[PDB]
Amino acid sequence: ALRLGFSPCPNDTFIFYALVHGRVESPVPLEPVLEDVETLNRWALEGRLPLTKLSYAAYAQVRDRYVALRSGGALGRGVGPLVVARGPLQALEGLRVAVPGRHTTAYFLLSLYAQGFVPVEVRYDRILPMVAQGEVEAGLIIHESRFTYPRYGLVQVVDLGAWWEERTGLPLPLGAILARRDLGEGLIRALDEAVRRSVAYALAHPEEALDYMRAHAQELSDEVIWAHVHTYVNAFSLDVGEEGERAVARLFAEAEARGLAAPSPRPLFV
């Protein structure tokens, strides 16, 4: 009955596998809608879905319409987006950089890191080939590209997650699961517990989610699928925690300092 948006990447299908297949209790039935994260980011601007995975940078733009669940998100220290190129670069000034979506946390972090580049916005899976073929000088990559970029002969220019850690001493908030405020407080709290249970179920029976992950990432090898969930699913996926809350506050403080997001007294989490 409730549409639930998330991406077909192994981390999201791993996290929602149990909830989608009735392996854990849910307060209401759910209808998954699998989309690219930038598509979900755009949809959230219109408040389209009542439940949706969203880039944390994008959540900062819809706090009056959505609240973040404490569970199901993507935050951490070794999950940062990377910038890659065909060879070392002195700087990104004046260079074309393929990016996965202007509303992504990846794009926001690249913008904190460097300011003289020319962004070329494309689907994330077009980035590695575009860099290798010389269509752009660098690429901001997310998802499973962090494991496959060497296959394209590329090198890491910067690991923005590491950059963020050095700058803030905190993990990097990448993606969150948001509930539309009009669903009501009780149902939202119940959904937060449901999502936490789904994460815990997959952590306890990972192999059970495998068919579902493959079904939505058919071009990926099982090796890449297992590496992807191992990298992106961690303690923060079960609960943002006190450190994750501090991290999100710092990310939003940086956004507010650049007029990218409007301040709000509303609590960040359910």
Ligand SMILES: [K+]
């Ligand atoms: K690898």
